[PDB]
Amino acid sequence: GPHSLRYFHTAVSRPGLGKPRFISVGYVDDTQFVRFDSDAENPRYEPRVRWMEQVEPEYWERNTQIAKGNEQIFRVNLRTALRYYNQSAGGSHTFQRMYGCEVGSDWRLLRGYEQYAYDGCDYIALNEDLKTWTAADMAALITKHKWEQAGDAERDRAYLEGTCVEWLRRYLQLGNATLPRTDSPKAHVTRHSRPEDKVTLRCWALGFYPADITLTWQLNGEELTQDMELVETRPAGDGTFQKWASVVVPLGKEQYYTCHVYHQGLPEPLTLRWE
């Protein structure tokens, strides 16, 4: 089955209030396993699961000094971004950066990642071949070139194709008796006596993984053409997820409306109804 190893860097500049705040955070799949947050006494890499407590102590010293490096490096990308977009200090600008491996039904990189966002907008992006670049505007174009002439993708390519996949295989082992396995949604339909001669049929789905699910309501077998409330899939906290979908129907006519759950963990697509 397919998994991933993904780290998310976030740096925010805060003028007057001292130096930028850096925050790295690792994630095996959707489970978070590590952290680094410069908003600290003497910051250092810490686990975020009981399973990461079993790794060699040399591990933390490494990622602490490595992240301190990147933190200092992101202070440079911020002040450089100021020069490019011709902006100015005083203000708050933030940098985001998602990098990491993706594996499929085998231990061999499927897609690698290394991408930056500046002020809620893409900036630069290592493409899927892991040796070319994509820039969103003309400021990022100046970066793309610096990276192209130097050959700086050779370092990401080498990490992502290599070290990265070895370590995901390491972490999926360590944390094999906890990390969410594919799990099927438990579904039911409550009803709620909504003001004025019509009951609100709400449809639920609870305790599933991964988060990718489809809830839909149908009237008399076919697509709905009234309306329905649909809240985004949400973390329970225990590692599984929750979604509901609700259509409003007249009293007595509740039997003609069926909810329709669709999940990978269901072998046959589910169809519910009131009672």
Binding site: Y7, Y59, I66, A67, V76, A81, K146, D152, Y159, T163
Partner: peptide, 9 residues
């Protein structure tokens, strides 16, 4: 484990 960035924008 992470790695030490070797490029700056």
């Amino acid at each position: 484990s992470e790695f030490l960035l070797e490029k700056r924008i």
